[PDB]
Amino acid sequence: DILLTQSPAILSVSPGERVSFSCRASQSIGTDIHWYQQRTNGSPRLLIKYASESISGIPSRFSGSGSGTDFTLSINSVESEDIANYYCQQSNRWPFTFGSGTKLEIKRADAAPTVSIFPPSSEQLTSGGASVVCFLNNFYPKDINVKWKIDGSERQNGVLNSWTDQDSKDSTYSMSSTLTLTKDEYERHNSYTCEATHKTSTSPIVKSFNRN
Amino acid sequence: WRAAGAATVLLVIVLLAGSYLAVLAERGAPGAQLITYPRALWWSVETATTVGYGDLYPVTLWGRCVAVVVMVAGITSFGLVTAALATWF
Amino acid sequence: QVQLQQPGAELVKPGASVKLSCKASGYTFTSDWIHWVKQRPGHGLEWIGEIIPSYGRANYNEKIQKKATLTADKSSSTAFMQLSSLTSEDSAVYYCARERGDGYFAVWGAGTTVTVSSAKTTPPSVYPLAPGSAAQTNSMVTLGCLVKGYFPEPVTVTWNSGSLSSGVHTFPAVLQSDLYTLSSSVTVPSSSWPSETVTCNVAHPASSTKVDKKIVPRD
Ligand SMILES: [Rb+]
Ligand SMILES: [Rb+]
Ligand SMILES: [Rb+]
Ligand SMILES: [Rb+]
């Protein structure tokens, strides 16, 4: 069956630049190759069909080229909304097949995180739970470290972090650190801080709050 | 032009039915290239006319049956070519 | 209007079997083929099989192990994929798509997240997230909402029924002891709050439970 090689797997380009994803067939397939876009948690979306034929509802930024075994999907002037996974699919010989995929990745100007700490809600406490959340928002690069201090002391237990894939609104990244204690363990500590260490600033960004 | 011109009808029916059935017959068969309606039709026309390029053809068994039906009901049906014997007027 | 409707989620115990669906709408022809594509988190798309409702025939991908059986229902315009005897391996999102017999998939379904676990369905708990009393505010302000204790995925967190979209981050859930937990966030101008109501609609298909929670300032 036909094999669709999509390499490189990741493409790093600067905004406004031109980018090219390539798809190679294990055998000549004429122009029976089709392109799909898939954003984080979205479903695939037809971008180009039959290698070059356009599609209505798709930016004129998108174009295709090639025939036989070598195909290229292009984007003129990439942009945040274009951050996704691109796939190629062929309909030359049965059964249709898919490309491994190619993640576009925009490189923008370093941005500092916007930290915000939040006290657990009463609605929750009312159920014996205490979740102190902290947000490290819209930073870049995506590399970042977050620290938890309780009454000035570093905490590592009960902390669950969550990172988001690059954002298609501004090509940035965001993370969610969540320290979860029992109402009890929470009822016996004054202040909770949340420090963010990011390449944008040597000294950490902190946000604290006292329970009283 | 009624006895002959009527054949053009049959021909277009065969060409069409052939395309649909062919795709139906061929899909599921690894390597079959006769798997989309459009070209499935280009094929039927080149089979009926028997131009024979060999850019497309059936691999499954029923595909070949549909093929034979198209060839017979098609070469016959190409009594439309004789219908254009009106150029002898 | 949306053309392929697929059930957001479906839980299944190992060895069990589920029959996914996909109801159509819009234009329909006898040349239409409905396909099914499997997609495990992190990995790409995998063709599973296809069917032609206006005839009923279906073909399946011979590379992978056959765990499905396609069927259609002309009248209701609904295609059914029967997945039998599932295992952790079978857990993933499954999309159905419509192909006009010309080779490409023009439109796709929202996909049905399927989880193969012995765990039990648990609706999520949505707590608010307003700044702490001493949070000096600036040109903008950040509010959010915690969604925990739910299983299996997924959940859809919108803000003000979707009217509030600019400035929202919904972090990927994290699993711990059979229960998922995630948090969404929204940033609006400091002025617009709390004069202008801000709620986070949270939906959990696996339990048919959608909940609203207004985010007002702490007492
Ligand atoms: Rb010939
Ligand atoms: Rb020939
Ligand atoms: Rb030939
Ligand atoms: Rb002849």
XYZ file of C-alpha atoms and ligand atoms in Angstrom:
524
model
C 0.000 0.000 0.000
C 1.254 3.554 -0.608
C 3.465 5.128 2.000
C 3.323 8.867 2.663
C 6.540 10.222 4.145
C 6.183 13.610 5.825
C 9.529 15.056 6.878
C 10.644 17.026 8.800
C 8.074 16.329 11.532
C 8.318 19.854 12.911
C 8.855 23.112 11.062
C 9.996 26.284 12.816
C 9.368 29.500 10.925
C 9.255 33.219 11.686
C 5.985 35.128 11.358
C 5.174 36.500 7.900
C 7.742 34.085 6.406
C 6.964 31.446 3.732
C 6.864 27.804 4.867
C 6.849 24.512 2.920
C 5.780 21.059 4.122
C 6.791 18.140 1.892
C 5.121 14.759 1.305
C 6.776 11.923 -0.600
C 4.976 8.913 -2.073
C 6.494 5.450 -2.118
C 5.377 5.381 -5.770
C 4.071 7.713 -8.489
C 0.498 8.766 -7.707
C 0.052 11.546 -10.246
C -1.695 14.320 -8.359
C -4.054 12.272 -6.196
C -2.636 13.820 -3.018
C -4.764 15.941 -0.619
C -3.955 18.229 2.290
C -5.609 18.567 5.707
C -5.174 20.919 8.605
C -5.821 19.913 12.219
C -5.493 22.336 15.100
C -5.103 21.239 18.699
C -8.331 19.376 19.529
C -9.959 20.140 16.219
C -10.939 17.746 13.465
C -9.119 17.545 10.154
C -9.871 20.261 7.599
C -9.419 19.946 3.826
C -6.872 22.609 2.747
C -5.970 21.660 -0.817
C -7.299 18.814 -2.984
C -5.645 17.045 -5.898
C -2.310 18.667 -5.027
C -3.041 22.141 -6.338
C -6.803 22.727 -6.652
C -7.904 25.320 -4.060
C -10.819 25.101 -1.638
C -13.400 27.733 -0.713
C -13.080 29.101 2.802
C -9.306 28.672 2.777
C -6.819 31.597 2.814
C -5.082 32.305 -0.480
C -2.028 31.967 1.748
C -2.314 28.205 1.142
C -1.125 26.547 -2.069
C 0.029 23.158 -3.324
C 2.575 21.852 -5.832
C 3.965 18.642 -7.281
C 3.154 15.449 -9.096
C 4.152 11.805 -9.018
C 5.909 11.229 -5.706
C 6.952 14.680 -4.472
C 4.422 17.160 -3.089
C 4.610 20.509 -1.301
C 1.960 22.433 0.680
C 2.832 26.118 1.027
C 1.870 29.037 3.226
C 2.799 32.612 2.336
C 3.203 34.717 5.466
C 2.532 32.226 8.237
C 0.720 33.406 11.368
C -0.528 32.239 14.748
C -3.770 30.902 13.342
C -1.683 28.572 11.143
C -0.125 26.655 14.020
C -1.360 23.108 13.548
C -0.623 19.616 12.256
C -0.581 19.139 8.539
C -1.316 15.803 6.869
C -1.246 14.575 3.277
C -3.554 11.793 2.087
C -3.651 9.908 -1.215
C -6.412 8.451 -3.328
C -4.405 7.016 -6.224
C -4.513 3.341 -5.218
C -6.670 1.591 -2.618
C -6.745 1.810 0.350
C -6.326 5.560 0.977
C -3.410 6.413 3.244
C -2.144 9.196 5.493
C 1.083 11.056 6.089
C 2.762 10.811 9.451
C 2.118 14.496 10.039
C 4.020 17.789 10.262
C 3.635 20.256 13.104
C 4.090 23.891 12.150
C 5.701 26.008 14.782
C 6.020 29.776 14.803
C 8.907 31.486 16.516
C 7.956 34.865 17.982
C 9.612 37.394 20.312
C 10.311 36.247 23.884
C 7.363 37.087 26.113
C 7.254 37.095 29.899
C 4.644 35.029 31.783
C 1.582 36.555 33.396
C 1.318 34.830 36.756
C -1.921 34.847 38.737
C -2.556 32.906 41.936
C -6.055 31.892 43.074
C -7.379 30.832 46.486
C -9.489 27.689 46.659
C -13.240 28.339 46.435
C -15.558 28.090 49.429
C -17.922 25.941 47.348
C -15.038 23.498 47.305
C -13.813 23.943 50.869
C -17.437 23.169 51.789
C -16.559 19.713 50.468
C -13.273 19.252 52.322
C -11.180 20.285 49.349
C -8.528 22.959 48.882
C -7.106 23.600 45.427
C -4.804 26.596 45.125
C -4.289 27.322 41.427
C -1.710 29.417 39.615
C -1.555 30.529 35.984
C 1.614 31.177 33.984
C 0.110 32.832 30.900
C 1.192 33.875 27.420
C 4.924 33.366 27.702
C 7.604 32.338 25.207
C 9.773 30.259 24.853
C 7.615 27.517 26.320
C 10.383 26.558 28.700
C 9.451 27.665 32.185
C 9.629 26.505 35.813
C 7.071 27.093 38.582
C 7.668 26.798 42.330
C 5.379 26.417 45.333
C 6.139 27.822 48.778
C 3.915 27.377 51.815
C 4.504 29.907 54.581
C 7.827 30.481 52.876
C 8.619 26.772 52.513
C 8.944 24.916 49.185
C 6.135 22.436 48.441
C 6.341 19.539 45.941
C 3.545 17.227 47.025
C 0.068 17.633 45.602
C 1.221 19.821 42.729
C -0.027 18.952 39.229
C 1.117 21.026 36.254
C -0.487 21.207 32.818
C 0.954 22.817 29.720
C -0.885 23.875 26.583
C 0.391 23.447 23.045
C 1.442 26.601 21.222
C -1.424 29.079 20.996
C -2.965 29.871 17.609
C -3.925 33.370 18.739
C -0.430 34.700 19.499
C 2.030 31.841 19.021
C 2.681 31.675 22.787
C 2.403 29.117 25.574
C 0.680 28.791 28.929
C 0.834 26.473 31.953
C -1.399 25.549 34.918
C 0.103 24.496 38.268
C -2.432 23.142 40.789
C -1.579 22.439 44.429
C -4.388 20.444 46.060
C -4.603 19.881 49.824
C -7.429 18.896 52.172
C -9.372 21.695 53.855
C -7.403 20.628 56.944
C -3.878 20.822 55.510
C -5.049 24.125 54.056
C -6.592 25.312 57.312
C -3.139 25.195 58.895
C -0.880 27.369 56.757
C -0.820 31.140 56.428
C 0.381 32.161 52.977
C 0.832 30.322 49.684
C 3.156 31.674 47.024
C 3.745 30.646 43.432
C 7.051 31.568 41.761
C 7.687 31.576 38.016
C 11.206 31.353 36.605
C 11.383 32.372 32.948
C 14.150 33.216 30.463
C 12.622 36.695 30.211
C 13.723 37.662 33.728
C 16.624 36.456 35.891
C 14.608 37.024 39.084
C 11.377 34.955 39.480
C 7.823 36.288 39.154
C 5.853 35.607 42.331
C 2.255 35.755 43.539
C 1.164 34.933 47.090
C -1.902 35.234 49.299
C -2.679 34.656 52.986
C -5.715 32.616 54.025
C -6.974 35.300 56.443
C -31.865 9.026 -36.607
C -34.233 7.344 -34.135
C -33.111 3.711 -34.515
C -29.449 4.700 -34.266
C -29.505 7.883 -32.187
C -31.303 5.813 -29.553
C -28.150 3.747 -29.050
C -26.336 6.862 -27.830
C -28.711 6.531 -24.894
C -27.810 2.931 -24.039
C -24.133 3.895 -24.369
C -24.382 6.700 -21.847
C -26.257 4.347 -19.498
C -23.546 1.687 -19.770
C -20.718 4.210 -19.423
C -22.385 5.540 -16.275
C -23.477 2.253 -14.669
C -20.036 0.893 -15.517
C -18.239 3.670 -13.658
C -20.329 3.197 -10.493
C -20.139 -0.601 -10.473
C -16.427 -0.557 -11.331
C -15.553 1.659 -8.365
C -17.856 -0.513 -6.288
C -16.164 -3.671 -7.532
C -12.581 -2.394 -7.331
C -12.412 -0.701 -3.954
C -11.259 -3.085 -1.231
C -8.774 -4.599 -3.661
C -5.239 -3.569 -2.635
C -3.631 -1.733 -5.514
C -6.802 -1.178 -7.511
C -6.488 2.183 -9.264
C -10.055 2.178 -10.623
C -11.495 3.601 -7.360
C -13.061 7.026 -7.918
C -16.144 7.824 -10.002
C -14.688 10.396 -12.383
C -11.738 8.444 -13.794
C -13.928 5.381 -13.407
C -15.922 7.041 -16.178
C -12.871 8.041 -18.254
C -12.016 4.376 -18.103
C -15.404 3.149 -19.265
C -15.249 5.493 -22.238
C -11.790 4.291 -23.168
C -12.955 0.725 -22.717
C -16.123 1.093 -24.771
C -14.198 2.830 -27.547
C -11.457 0.303 -26.838
C -8.924 3.078 -27.423
C -6.838 1.144 -24.979
C -4.163 3.238 -23.358
C -3.764 1.080 -20.345
C -3.610 3.916 -17.889
C -6.481 2.329 -15.974
C -8.014 -1.123 -15.669
C -9.665 -3.600 -13.261
C -7.842 -6.024 -10.990
C -10.654 -7.711 -9.049
C -12.794 -10.440 -10.627
C -16.110 -8.607 -10.650
C -14.244 -5.543 -11.852
C -13.342 -7.581 -14.902
C -16.921 -8.791 -15.186
C -18.200 -5.192 -15.154
C -15.411 -4.696 -17.690
C -16.631 -7.389 -20.053
C -20.200 -6.074 -19.775
C -18.962 -2.584 -20.700
C -16.912 -3.928 -23.624
C -19.795 -5.958 -25.105
C -22.709 -3.647 -24.419
C -20.184 -0.942 -25.317
C -18.555 -2.107 -28.545
C -22.027 -3.089 -29.730
C -23.525 0.128 -28.466
C -20.870 1.960 -30.422
C -23.329 1.448 -33.268
C -23.519 5.210 -32.685
C -20.369 5.487 -34.796
C -22.357 3.896 -37.619
C -25.152 6.317 -36.733
C -22.714 9.038 -37.786
C -23.024 7.473 -41.245
C -24.988 10.701 -41.828
C -21.638 12.188 -42.917
C -22.392 10.148 -46.019
C -25.094 12.757 -46.705
C -24.992 23.892 9.212
C -22.992 20.992 10.727
C -23.054 17.934 8.430
C -21.802 14.936 10.498
C -22.961 14.482 14.095
C -20.968 12.211 16.349
C -21.514 11.478 20.065
C -18.790 13.297 22.002
C -17.918 10.312 24.168
C -18.377 6.619 24.862
C -16.966 4.620 27.788
C -16.243 0.880 27.409
C -14.921 -1.909 29.671
C -12.195 -4.196 28.276
C -13.713 -6.997 26.237
C -16.910 -5.006 25.773
C -18.130 -3.412 22.537
C -19.662 -0.078 21.494
C -21.545 0.913 18.348
C -20.576 4.462 17.387
C -22.792 6.564 15.151
C -22.643 9.402 12.652
C -25.805 11.112 11.424
C -25.648 13.089 8.168
C -27.378 16.177 6.760
C -27.004 18.602 3.868
C -26.550 17.170 0.360
C -26.594 13.376 -0.128
C -25.958 11.217 -3.220
C -25.666 7.549 -4.124
C -21.991 8.129 -4.787
C -21.289 9.007 -1.134
C -18.844 7.045 0.994
C -18.604 7.445 4.770
C -15.151 6.721 6.234
C -13.934 6.183 9.789
C -10.605 7.368 11.106
C -8.965 6.357 14.365
C -6.588 8.727 16.178
C -4.804 7.956 19.426
C -3.690 10.946 21.484
C -0.391 12.311 20.233
C -0.367 10.182 17.072
C -1.801 10.832 13.631
C -4.786 9.703 11.580
C -5.490 6.038 10.774
C -8.054 4.968 8.119
C -10.202 2.158 9.518
C -12.737 1.396 6.801
C -15.386 2.771 4.464
C -19.006 2.138 3.469
C -21.379 3.089 0.658
C -24.866 3.452 2.222
C -26.579 3.638 -1.184
C -25.545 -0.015 -1.570
C -24.321 -1.049 1.877
C -20.901 -2.421 0.980
C -17.919 -1.824 3.241
C -14.195 -2.436 3.015
C -11.719 -2.357 5.905
C -8.041 -1.567 6.423
C -6.209 -4.904 6.163
C -3.002 -3.746 7.893
C -4.655 -3.206 11.305
C -6.605 -5.872 13.171
C -10.272 -5.827 12.305
C -12.208 -4.620 15.332
C -15.028 -2.926 13.440
C -18.125 -3.626 11.352
C -19.721 -0.824 9.357
C -23.434 -0.483 8.633
C -25.678 2.344 7.430
C -29.373 3.275 7.639
C -30.565 5.042 4.484
C -33.709 6.617 5.994
C -32.172 8.275 9.075
C -28.975 9.022 7.160
C -26.945 7.417 9.935
C -23.805 5.289 9.628
C -22.840 2.906 12.411
C -19.425 1.584 13.338
C -19.471 -1.439 15.637
C -16.211 -1.859 17.579
C -16.041 -5.205 19.417
C -13.914 -6.576 22.277
C -11.955 -3.452 23.125
C -8.681 -2.944 24.987
C -6.605 0.052 26.131
C -5.228 0.052 22.607
C -8.643 0.825 21.100
C -9.093 3.991 23.159
C -8.883 7.072 20.960
C -10.901 9.639 19.023
C -12.815 8.299 16.015
C -13.931 10.637 13.222
C -16.406 9.805 10.469
C -16.106 11.825 7.249
C -17.992 12.149 3.991
C -16.261 11.405 0.698
C -17.970 12.201 -2.584
C -16.326 9.221 -4.225
C -13.723 11.599 -5.632
C -11.041 10.638 -3.119
C -10.853 13.378 -0.480
C -12.745 13.994 2.756
C -14.529 17.343 2.349
C -16.182 17.366 5.764
C -15.470 15.552 9.030
C -17.282 14.671 12.243
C -16.408 16.192 15.629
C -15.221 12.739 16.522
C -16.160 10.548 19.440
C -13.620 10.170 22.202
C -13.669 6.544 23.278
C -12.111 5.250 26.471
C -11.644 1.577 27.324
C -11.495 1.406 31.126
C -12.940 -0.477 34.113
C -13.518 3.115 35.842
C -16.952 4.634 36.359
C -18.429 7.800 34.848
C -18.079 10.843 37.078
C -19.468 14.310 36.315
C -16.986 17.133 37.044
C -17.019 19.671 39.880
C -16.785 23.293 38.691
C -15.425 25.742 41.268
C -14.839 29.432 40.481
C -11.563 31.334 40.446
C -11.685 35.026 41.331
C -8.607 37.039 42.370
C -7.639 37.033 46.016
C -8.840 40.099 47.927
C -5.391 41.765 47.752
C -4.819 41.273 44.031
C -3.988 44.740 42.703
C -5.578 44.821 39.260
C -4.379 46.413 36.026
C -5.707 47.168 32.529
C -6.860 43.537 32.399
C -8.000 40.908 34.890
C -7.863 37.108 34.894
C -10.685 34.868 36.101
C -11.060 31.129 35.554
C -12.706 27.961 36.863
C -11.556 24.512 38.166
C -12.943 21.321 36.681
C -11.984 18.167 38.600
C -13.086 14.694 39.603
C -14.445 13.822 36.155
C -13.995 10.693 34.034
C -13.595 9.878 31.158
C -12.541 12.667 28.827
C -13.552 14.992 27.305
C -15.212 18.183 28.555
C -15.891 21.465 26.754
C -15.395 24.712 28.630
C -16.894 27.788 26.961
C -17.236 31.279 28.397
C -20.629 32.981 28.387
C -22.089 30.364 26.063
C -19.276 31.024 23.597
C -19.757 34.794 23.269
C -16.577 35.241 25.316
C -13.784 33.656 23.277
C -10.894 36.113 23.044
C -8.461 35.460 25.883
C -9.236 31.887 26.883
C -6.820 29.084 27.815
C -8.098 25.604 28.626
C -5.228 23.539 30.003
C -4.962 19.802 29.120
C -6.451 17.577 31.836
C -4.176 15.573 34.160
C -5.116 12.091 35.347
C -4.763 10.991 38.961
C -6.404 7.982 40.564
C -9.015 7.543 37.811
C -10.202 11.172 37.794
C -9.415 14.019 35.403
C -8.842 17.628 36.344
C -8.383 20.705 34.154
C -8.759 24.477 34.357
C -9.778 27.056 31.819
C -8.967 30.741 32.036
C -10.320 33.987 30.659
C -8.937 37.506 30.654
C -11.110 40.565 30.227
C -10.589 44.273 30.903
C -10.573 45.135 34.618
C -13.411 47.612 34.002
C -15.818 45.132 32.416
C -15.795 43.142 35.688
C -17.813 42.295 37.623
C -20.407 44.703 36.223
C -20.603 42.475 33.144
C -21.495 38.896 34.077
C -18.858 36.243 33.286
C -19.796 32.553 33.395
C -17.987 29.404 32.315
C -20.334 26.826 30.672
C -18.738 23.384 31.230
C -19.967 20.317 29.365
C -19.249 16.633 30.042
C -20.746 14.342 27.329
C -20.000 11.059 29.119
C -22.566 12.046 31.748
C -24.848 14.330 29.729
C -24.041 17.076 32.212
C -23.463 20.711 31.372
C -23.060 23.262 34.140
C -22.821 27.015 34.470
C -20.905 28.872 37.150
C -20.832 32.646 37.435
C -17.499 34.154 38.449
C -18.131 37.026 40.851
C -15.601 38.701 43.178
C -14.852 37.105 46.535
C -16.982 38.392 49.430
Rb -8.563 -1.401 -30.406
Rb -6.234 -1.005 -28.161
Rb -2.818 -0.424 -24.866
Rb -13.680 -2.272 -35.341
